[PDB]
Design a protein around this ligand. Sequence first.
Ligand SMILES: *[C@@H]1O[C@H](CO)[C@@H](O)[C@H](O)[C@H]1NC(C)=O
Lengths: 49, 50, 49, 100
Amino acid sequence: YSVLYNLAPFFTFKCYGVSPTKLNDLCFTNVYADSFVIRGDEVRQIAPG
Amino acid sequence: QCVNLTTRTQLPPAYTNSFTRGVYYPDKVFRSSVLHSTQDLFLPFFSNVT
Amino acid sequence: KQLSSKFGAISSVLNDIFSRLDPPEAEVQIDRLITGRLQSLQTYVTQQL
Amino acid sequence: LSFELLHAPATVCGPKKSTNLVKNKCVNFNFNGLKGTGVLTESNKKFLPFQQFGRDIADTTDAVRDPQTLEILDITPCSFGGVSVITPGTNTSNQVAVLY
Ligand SMILES: *[C@@H]1O[C@H](CO)[C@@H](O)[C@H](O)[C@H]1NC(C)=O
């Protein structure tokens, strides 16, 4: 994630969940990478609950 | 490439018992000399196996 | 066996909570675990008395 | 990105591989992302190949499978203890006795 933090100019953790600064020591399992494009302010619609 | 078979004999399936079959390890954790209860897929005892 | 309870958290180990959750809410989660185990200890003490 | 945690072994980890195993020392460790502190000794337990880590009655980690080394290296079996003080009243004397 260290190179990925500067590869793209993405928003820096506007979400709730795992610790952002401690992400090096996370041995997660079975990710699901889904990519799609939306319009306008629909980013806030993608939230748990 | 496949060959059709016409020598099959008609016979309805039979049913027998499953007294003490269908138990496995639900997790790979090592527990010794203890009793544990887990919620997982399990074949019921004395079920009706074909 | 009461140590294996989660009390509404995501894990039964405080180390995982400390190393996997943001400290502003990890403090609240640790406080919830502390007060749940304190309630269990109080119940055990009342039974012992 | 979903970061769910499963009992299956992690196929991805951070690049923090260094040091070496130290035996018979009550030292801290962060094996497989689980922080703990205890001695690293051996035992006579027979471990199946699919088994990675074990648990006790209280669901506390007491076993691990070290990658590329393949032994037990039991988790936090380290000892502990308490302290007790034996002394008479302050009017008589002030000597103390320590007890474990
Ligand atoms: C199994 O099912 C068959 C028909 O579905 C039935 O005749 C038989 O009695 C059943 N056996 C048991 C043990 O339920």
